[PDB]
């Protein structure tokens, strides 16, 4: 059949003897004096004891066997375990045991009535009195009370852990009651918490079998694995494995007990010799509480027992999910060079012989070359250096067949992609430059995992979506990526920075005077006005829109037009002033795509420069192109983008950054103000502290002035000469990076926290005073330990993001939801009570192609409801926002949809990539992680706030807020500067300490009460005194502030689709027929219990609030969860009860082996597409 759902939970002790049957016992000897393998005990091959001469009877047929001595046609030689499972039995029959029972009071305390001491009896050190015969001391009992001697005071009676098995049926018959008389404990508060947990644990045993077999009475390990043979190589030898020795402390103990018990063995001797047996159980399960090192009493390495290794932390769960081991790929260095811009790649011309060897062998079989496939495996091994004909047949195989190039580490969706292998020379694997901006890494010897897809159904599934010429142009986040990265920008920026070299201001009677005279000396081709224009009258480039401006590029080639934009009149489409330099740009993009008609109305002219706008040109072009042509651009801007800079050259000489000749005296006035604040001390004025910050602000301002003077000196005169600005404006330079070199930047702060006294005498050209560098280093330390510390905690937080949003996939078609969200067009500023334009940078990416909740009327045409408001509509609303017609643009966010198992159709406006609506199959659940999967490295963990709200952890100072909206009420005293809020009702007492105690008045819903300036009280209180109204929005607004501080491109619903997961769980109150009054049912699934039953029972609920890590421990499935930091409690709660895993889930399929429910394997794309015309015609009658 076909794999589908999955089942688990506990298994009765009788079921344990089912899978294992028998074959066990005997010591755990891993060898003998001779015959290292067999041992007839530990890992003995089932029915293999030297020469059993049997067992082969169970097998029907297939082959012969029974060879008397040595071995027959058994598994030992072949099929031995075959990596398959092989349970033993470990026999066992002692008093009792324990399956760890986790550390969340499971299988005990909850189903019983004892804590912090439930182990005292489970470890054979107490007495769980489970009998009634009327005591004496203080009446009888029914639980633990006989702590030694007590149980003998009367001399049933159970002092061992064996009682755990006795409370099986005793709790089973009372189970029905444990669900009735237990729930009988109505409110009363306090204890109404235990009754909830006790009912959840007993709710499992309430149905679907599952008995309290927690009291293990016979374990069953594994033998096939652990057994590593001799491993020489290099300089070493010997070998072995675990799981065996650490297991020897279980069977042997069970046997020795069978030898002691059988003979004369008094109580005391058995009680301790038994507790060690269960200890061995937990020992084989998980080593904790005390541990069990090797070579006792000496301490060394902790024995590996599932914990952290296998079924636990990174060891056999983190490595098997994704970080497996590809059996078809390789690694190499990185290189760059004009290949063809996308559509191609590098990849060696030697190793490729192995990656594409398979099909390559079959090709030669028919191409005369190799006589057979086998022979083709012995012509390329001894490095005979073929380099003959084979390199040709290899091309046929590498024709239209793409390859997947990966980058480590990985970040966002832009971390893989695919190209077409174009074997070059050597071994270095090169790629296109632009692609680097997606991996974030400088070429310095880095590698790239080169994966290769085999199946042809994987090739088309790749080159059609993973091709760099598709899923790279317009990435997620918000802004484009394929845009011309660094370098390229400077290749077109070096020709549009004006040529005004200052010539003066003469005048001619229509070019008959200062035309020839000035051509001799003074006044060249800069200013000077005549008739109307200026010096533009000199080289009139005629031509036309026939074959580009001839006279233009023609004169430039010769010793005429200096190019580099020297101001010249062309003819193009009209008498302009654009220089032949810009003409080139428009000519490059012209022939590239098709006719300048598009680039003409797109490319600007008023403010050319080619600054940080190259991302808008290509972006705006997509609307009139669409990959096919778009790709051509990034290719045209390539060739010229580098050649122009090559056949020109621009070096960074030590003088290239001319020192501000008008700076020296500036420091004089700044230093002349030093004594000013210094002599104030000798006169006893202004506290030493006031003096401190007084001088700080001084240099904090002058620095900006000096930077301004420099940036200015580098603006007017010295245009193209200064490269430090050519990249600072828009290419590959930082503005604050300039004030460092020619500047003087020295406002460094002490290592702890206190800006030093005197700054730093930067001016690199002049070596520091040997003290300046040591002083500036104190601050240049946090700028490296923080970025590197982005793998300590922050790096282990992104996982939490990918776990939460997982089963979120865009499917179905038109769900139909009323309630909608109204995105704010204007935000407030804590500083001053006044809304701002939100800087536009937030509104744009916040409404980029959405779903207008309702008709939008705003001067002119209306924006129909459900209309995909592209970038155009956005600008139309922003520019019309200043007018005063719109304040809250209506829209539909993923936060409004009755579907927790699936995303939503057409609701997630635009698939932010192909410039169109999302496609059914786009796992936004993973894309949402790709959005946040980038800023991580660009943060400051050394304080952390983004995760604070996620886990809903109460922020610093709690930031107390008004839970209710009363009135003013502002009373002050001595130390009780607390503020209250009430109105004709009850008054709460907010012990407001001493800090942000503002006035304010007229009550307040929540706001902040004044003290909570930022990071309002944990969402717990919000939703508690508000609901899923502010919770779902407060995050999308606050959380982004941490991103807006660094100007992030991502935004939109990428972060608005992950919130619905943390707010899709509800509680229970007076349920209908459904058990558990407490409960913790999910959203949609709960709506079902109130949808079908609505045609009858009231099933009210309350919008609960869970963190980000909590949305994993308790989910609709189990395969997920764990990981984080609790791969122990998960499998517990997950077990016991039925808790049947769902089906629709990326992981569920990847792990189990099923196909992806998303991608091309979605339930919306599994039909037929084969019909060569006549096929449909034939079947038409064949039916």
């Amino acid at each position: 059949k076909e794999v589908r759902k999955v089942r688990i939970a506990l298994a009765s002790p009788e079921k344990i003897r089912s899978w294992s049957y028998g074959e066990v016992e005997k010591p755990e000897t891993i060898n003998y004096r001779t015959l290292k393998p067999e041992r007839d005990g530990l890992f003995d091959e089932r029915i293999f004891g030297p020469i059993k001469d049997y067992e082969c009877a169970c097998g029907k047929y297939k082959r012969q066997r029974f060879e008397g001595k040595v071995c027959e046609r058994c598994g030992v030689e072949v099929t031995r375990s075959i990596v398959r499972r092989y349970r033993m039995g470990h026999i066992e029959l002692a008093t009792p045991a324990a399956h760890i029972w986790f550390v969340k009071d499971v299988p005990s305390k909850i189903g019983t009535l004892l804590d912090l001491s439930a182990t005292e009896l489970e470890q054979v050190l107490y007495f769980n009195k489970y009998i009634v015969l009327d005591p004496k001391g203080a009446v009888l009992d029914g639980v633990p009370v006989e702590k030694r001697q007590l149980l003998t005071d009367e001399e049933d009676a159970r002092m061992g852990a064996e009682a755990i098995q006795e409370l099986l049926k005793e709790l089973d018959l009372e189970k029905l009651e444990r669900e009735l008389l237990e729930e009988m404990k109505h409110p009363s508060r306090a204890r109404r918490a235990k009754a909830r947990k006790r009912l959840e644990v007993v709710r499992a045993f309430l149905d679907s079998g599952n008995r309290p077999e927690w009291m293990i009475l016979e374990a069953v390990p594994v033998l096939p694995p652990d057994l590593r043979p001799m491993v020489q190589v290099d300089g070493g030898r010997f070998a072995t494995s675990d799981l065996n020795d650490l297991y020897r402390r279980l069977i042997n103990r069970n046997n020795r007990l069978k030898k002691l018990l059988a003979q004369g063995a008094p109580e005391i001797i058995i009680r301790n010799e038994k507790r060690m047996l269960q200890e061995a159980v937990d020992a084989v399960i998980d080593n904790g509480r005390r541990g069990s090192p090797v070579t006792n009493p000496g301490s060394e390495r902790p024995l590996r027992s599932l914990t952290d290794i296998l079924s636990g932390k990174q060891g056999r769960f983190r490595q098997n999910l994704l970080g497996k081991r590809v059996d078809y790929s390789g690694r190499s260095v990185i290189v760059v060079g004009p290949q063809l811009k996308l559509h191609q790649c590098g990849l060696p011309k030697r190793m490729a012989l192995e990656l594409f060897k398979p099909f390559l062998l079959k090709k030669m079989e028919e191409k005369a070359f190799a006589p057979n496939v086998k022979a083709a495996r012995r012509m390329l091994e001894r490095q005979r250096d073929i380099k003959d004909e084979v390199w040709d047949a290899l091309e046929e195989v590498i024709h239209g067949k793409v390859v997947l190039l990966n980058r480590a580490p990985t970040l966002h969706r832009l971390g893989i992609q695919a190209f077409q292998p174009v074997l070059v020379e050597g071994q270095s694997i090169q790629l296109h430059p632009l692609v680097c901006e997606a991996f974030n890494a400088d070429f310095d010897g880095d590698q790239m995992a080169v994966h290769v897809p085999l199946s042809s159904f994987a090739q088309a599934e790749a080159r059609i979506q993973m091709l760099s010429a598709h899923n790279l142009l317009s990435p997620a986040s918000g802004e484009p990526l394929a845009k011309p990265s660094r370098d390229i920008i400077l290749g077109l920026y070096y020709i549009t920075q004006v040529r005004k070299e200052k010539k003066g201001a003469g005048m001619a009677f229509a070019t008959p005077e200062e035309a020839l005279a000035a051509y001799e000396r003074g006044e060249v081709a800069l200013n000077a006005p005549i008739v109307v224009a200026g010096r533009e009258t000199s080289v009139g480039r005629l031509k036309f829109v026939f074959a580009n401006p001839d006279e233009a590029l023609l004169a430039v080639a010769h010793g005429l037009l200096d190019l580099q934009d020297v101001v010249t009149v062309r003819y193009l489409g009209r008498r302009l002033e654009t220089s032949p330099g810009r003409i080139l740009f428009a000519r490059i993009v012209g022939e590239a795509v098709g006719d300048e008609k598009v680039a003409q109305e797109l490319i600007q002219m008023d403010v050319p420069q080619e600054k940080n706008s190259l991302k808008d040109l290509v972006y705006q072009a997509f609307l009139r192109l669409g990959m096919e042509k778009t790709a051509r651009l990034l290719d045209a801007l390539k060739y010229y983008g580098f050649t122009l800079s090559t056949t020109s050259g621009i070096t960074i000489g030590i003088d290239d950054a001319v020192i501000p000749e008008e700076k020296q005296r500036y420091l004089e006035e700044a230093d002349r103000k030093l004594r000013q604040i210094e002599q104030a001390y000798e006169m006893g004025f202004l506290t030493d502290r006031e003096r401190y910050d007084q001088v700080i602000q001084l240099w904090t301002e002058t620095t900006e002035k000096v930077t301004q003077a420099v940036f200015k000196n580098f603006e007017e005169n010295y245009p193209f000469n200064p490269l430090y600005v050519m990249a600072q404006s828009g290419a590959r330079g930082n503005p604050q990076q300039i004030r460092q070199l020619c500047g003087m930047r020295g406002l460094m702060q002490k290592p702890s926290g206190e800006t030093f006294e005197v700054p730093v005498r930067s001016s690199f050209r002049e070596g520091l005073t040997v003290l300046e560098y040591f002083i500036s280093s104190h601050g240049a330390r946090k700028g490296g330990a923080d970025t590197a510390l982005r793998t300590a905690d922050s790096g282990y937080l992104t996982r939490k993001l990918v776990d939460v949003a997982h089963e979120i996939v865009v499917r179905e078609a038109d769900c139909g939801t009323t309630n909608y969200i109204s995105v704010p067009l204007f935000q407030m500023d804590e500083v001053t009570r006044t809304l701002r334009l939100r800087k536009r940078s937030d509104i744009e990416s916040g409404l980029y192609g959405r779903v207008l909740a309702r008709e939008v009327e705003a001067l002119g045409r209306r924006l129909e409801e459900g209309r995909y408001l592209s970038l155009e509509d956005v600008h139309f609303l922003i520019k019309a926002a200043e007018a005063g017609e719109v304040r809250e643009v209506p829209v539909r966010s993923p936060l409004t949809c009755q579907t927790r198992y699936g995303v939503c159709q057409k609701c997630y406006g635009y698939d932010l990539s192909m410039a169109r609506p999302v496609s059914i199959g786009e796992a936004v659940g993973v894309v949402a992680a790709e959005s946040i999967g980038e800023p991580g490295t660009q943060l400051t963990m050394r304080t952390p706030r983004v995760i604070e709200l996620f886990e809903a952890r109460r922020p610093k100072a709690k930031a107390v807020i008004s839970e209710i909206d009363g009135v003013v009420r502002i009373e002050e005293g001595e130390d009780r500067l607390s503020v209250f809020v009430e109105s004709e009702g009850f008054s709460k007492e907010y012990k407001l300490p001493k800090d942000a105690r503002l006035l304010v008045k007229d009550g307040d819903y929540v706001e902040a009460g004044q003290p909570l300036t930022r990071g309002a009280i944990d969402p717990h209180q919000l939703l508690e005194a508000k609901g899923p109204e502010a919770v779902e929005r407060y995050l999308v607004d606050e959380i982004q502030k941490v991103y807006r501080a660094q100007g992030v491109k991502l935004h939109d619903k990428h972060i608005e689709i992950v919130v619905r997961q943390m707010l899709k769980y509800v509680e229970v109150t007076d349920p209908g027929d459904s058990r558990l009054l407490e409960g913790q049912v999910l959203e949609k699934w709960d709506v079902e219990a109130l949808n079908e039953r609505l045609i009858a029972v009231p099933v009210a609920w309350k919008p609960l609030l869970m963190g980000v890590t909590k949305s994993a421990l308790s989910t609709k499935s189990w395969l997920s969860a764990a990981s984080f930091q609790n791969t122990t409690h998960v499998l517990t709660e997950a077990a016991i009860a039925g808790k049947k895993d769902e089906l629709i889930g990326l992981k569920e399929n990847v792990i189990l082996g099923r196909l992806i429910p998303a991608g091309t394997g979605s339930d919306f794309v599994r039909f037929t597409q084969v019909v060569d015309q006549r096929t449909l015609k034939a079947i038409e009658e064949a039916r």
């Binding site: 103990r253 005391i268 060891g315």
Partner: protein, 319 residues
């Protein structure tokens, strides 16, 4: 902090014995199996059935009494005598315990933890206290003090991080160990393997002496320190892919063969399934006898080899 303390508090909570209550209660054992032996040969219970089964009843703290009540005219005292002597398996064996523990603190290292050593140790009392010669006027005391360590040495050799080390290996290992440490303390450098032969005697050269330190004593690797060591070569993927391939190649290389030759090789060189039948069994079913069916075997070595020197295929041997 180990669980040994819990037992250390239960073992050191009950007092040992005075001095005279050691023999007065011991004699109960002697007359015990004796009074029990009365019914033994009386019905034929080997005197071991009346003891093992009765002792199980002596510990009511957790049947045969039937016929033990019909006591004839000559039986009525033996009853009380059997139960009176039943108290022999009562108090005794509750003291030695404490007197024990303070001994396992010696073998704290060799093998098995302190807690484990307790087992094999105290267990040595179960059989020691039993075989006590109440005759001699020495009084039981520091005797079982030995029946424990001897059980420990007989245990540390039985149980260890090895495989199977009898009384002929542990005693030799420690002997080669003390010697290696004996010559070391009387040389200045670590003695080789052969240089230790003279230290022993006859039979001990350098090979066998190396075979002793070859097996183990406690090594066998630290199991899996720091998925420790990879290494693997059993269910080789390519070997399996080439397994069927090399097989298919033969299925194809046999297409130029005749039944009265191919099948002959099939049954002869055990291929059909696994039966390595010989020309004798291949001649009975193939009409003709030996020779010519053997002249076809050679004909196969040649007629087939003649199809190899011209057709590359000698690359299937290295597999």
């Amino acid at each position: 902090s180990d669980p040994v303390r819990q037992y250390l508090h239960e073992i050191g909570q009950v007092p040992l014995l005075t001095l005279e209550e050691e023999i007065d209660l011991a004699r109960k054992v002697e007359e015990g199996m004796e009074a029990i032996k009365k019914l033994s040969e009386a019905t034929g219970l080997d005197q071991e059935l009346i003891r093992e089964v009765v002792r199980a009843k002596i510990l009511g703290t957790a049947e045969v009494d039937g016929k033990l009540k019909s006591l004839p005219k000559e039986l009525k005292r033996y009853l009380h005598i059997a139960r009176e002597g039943e108290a022999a398996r009562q108090h005794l064996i509750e003291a030695n315990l404490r007197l024990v523990v303070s001994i396992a603190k010696k073998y704290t290292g060799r093998g098995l933890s302190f807690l484990d050593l307790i087992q094999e140790g105290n267990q040595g009392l179960i059989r020691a206290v039993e075989k006590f010669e109440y005759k001699r006027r020495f009084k039981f005391s520091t005797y079982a003090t030995w029946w424990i360590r001897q059980a420990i040495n007989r245990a540390i050799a039985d149980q260890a991080r090895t495989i199977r080390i009898p009384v002929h290996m542990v005693e030799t290992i420690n002997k080669l160990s003390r010697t290696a440490r004996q010559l070391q303390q009387e040389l200045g450098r670590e003695p080789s393997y052969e240089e230790i032969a003279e230290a022993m005697g006859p039979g001990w050269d350098a090979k066998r002496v190396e075979e002793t330190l070859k097996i183990a004593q406690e090594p066998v690797s630290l199991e899996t320190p720091i998925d420790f060591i990879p290494d693997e070569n059993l269910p080789s993927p390519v070997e399996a892919a080439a397994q069927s391939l090399l097989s298919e190649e033969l299925e194809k290389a046999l297409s130029k063969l005749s039944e009265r030759e191919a099948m002959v090789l099939k049954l002869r060189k055990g291929l059909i399934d696994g039966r390595e039948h010989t020309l004798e069994e291949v001649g009975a079913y193939f009409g003709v006898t030996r020779e010519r069916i053997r002249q076809i075997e050679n004909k196969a070595l040649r007629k087939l080899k003649y199809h190899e020197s011209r057709t590359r295929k000698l690359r299937d041997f290295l597999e």
